[PDB]
Amino acid sequence: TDSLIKVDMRTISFDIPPQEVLTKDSVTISVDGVVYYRVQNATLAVANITNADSATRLLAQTTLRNALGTKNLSQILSDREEIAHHMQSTLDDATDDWGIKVERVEIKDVKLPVQ
Amino acid sequence: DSLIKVDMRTISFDIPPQEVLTKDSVTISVDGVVYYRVQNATLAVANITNADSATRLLAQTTLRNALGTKNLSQILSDREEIAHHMQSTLDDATDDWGIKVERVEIKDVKLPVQLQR
Numbered sequence: 001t002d003s004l005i006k007v008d009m010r011t012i013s014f015d016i017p018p019q020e021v022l023t024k025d026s027v028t029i030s031v032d033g034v035v036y037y038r039v040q041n042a043t044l045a046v047a048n049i050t051n052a053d054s055a056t057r058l059l060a061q062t063t064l065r066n067a068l069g070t071k072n073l074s075q076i077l078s079d080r081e082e083i084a085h086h087m088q089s090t091l092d093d094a095t096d097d098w099g100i101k102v103e104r105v106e107i108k109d110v111k112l113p114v115q
Numbered sequence: 116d117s118l119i120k121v122d123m124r125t126i127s128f129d130i131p132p133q134e135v136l137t138k139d140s141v142t143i144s145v146d147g148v149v150y151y152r153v154q155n156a157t158l159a160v161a162n163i164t165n166a167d168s169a170t171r172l173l174a175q176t177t178l179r180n181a182l183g184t185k186n187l188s189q190i191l192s193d194r195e196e197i198a199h200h201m202q203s204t205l206d207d208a209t210d211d212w213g214i215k216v217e218r219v220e221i222k223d224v225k226l227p228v229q230l231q232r
Contacts, residue, residue: 061121073187077141077231110226115191 007045011103016060018111025072030111033093035060036104044099050100053099057076059094064107073110080107121156125170125217128162130174134225138230139186147198149174150218160214170205177204183229194221224227 016033039045045052054113057062067087068076084105092102130147137143153159159166181197182190190197198219206216 075135077226077228080231098127110228112191112224112226114194 003042003046005046007039007042009039009042009075011026011036012038013019014060015108016057016064019061019067019068021068023068023073023076024070027032027073027075028113028115029068029070029073030109030113031076031098032108033060034108035102035103035107036106037095037100039099040069040101041099044097048098052095052100056091056095057098059092060105063090074105076110078087101105117156121153121159123154123156125150125152127151128172129170129176130171133175133178133182134227135179135182137182137187137190138184141181141188142216142230143187144223144227145178145179145182145190146222147174147218148222149216149219151209151214151216153213154215155213162212163201166209166214170209170212170214173208174201174205174219177201183202190224194224197221 013034013036016035018030018032021029021031028112064087067083067090071079085105088102088105091105095102127148130149132146133141134144134145140203153227154175178201181201198221200218202216205219209216
């Protein structure tokens with residue numbers, strides 16, 4: 001069926017709002033990020049609009065916190081691509097149930113508050 | 116006794132975000148606040164052109180210079196000594212214009228992750 005309702009099938013992005021994280025070397029940081037994704041299955045995505053919108057954003061936040069909590073501050077700067085690619089794999093696993101491919105994750109800013 | 120009343124108490128201005136490199140080659144974005152007051156009304160009014168030109172730009176240069184001489188770990192730990200050092204540098208320059216820099220505060224320190232080695 002050539003459905004009348006159509007969905008953007010190309011790369012789009014949402015921001016992960018700043019998450020407060022404790023590094024392995026005990027530094028308190030605020031980290032925000034960007035998730036790049038696209039609908040790969042229009043039928044699954046249309047079926048899961050409510051179940052994916054909320055759940056994906058929260059999972060992006062949790063995925064970030066868990067990944068960064070296991071690293072030293074130094075590692076977060078130098079291993080940023082490894083960390084991001086690991087997050088992308090974790091996020092892409094969960095989003096498949098909702099017809100979404102996560103293509104890329106980027107760690108944006110690491111804020112250091114008054115310690 | 117004067118009709119025009121120059122504010123003689125603490126005022127603040129913001130130092131716009133400064134992108135700079137640490138001693139250990141980390142790119143950071145840092146901003147701050149400078150708390151000052153007029154201590155000499157006559158001298159400040161006389162040197163108003165000097166103060167409006169130099170002070171804000173001096174706060175920027177002093178911040179950039181201080182952060183370039185510190186390691187990231189030191190910026191995390193010694194944020195108070197850096198601010199106190201800046202206060203002394205700024206206060207030395209503003210004294211000639213009847214202005215006392217009372218306190219410098221380092222607010223946000225961000226690591227643009229995409230912009231590193």
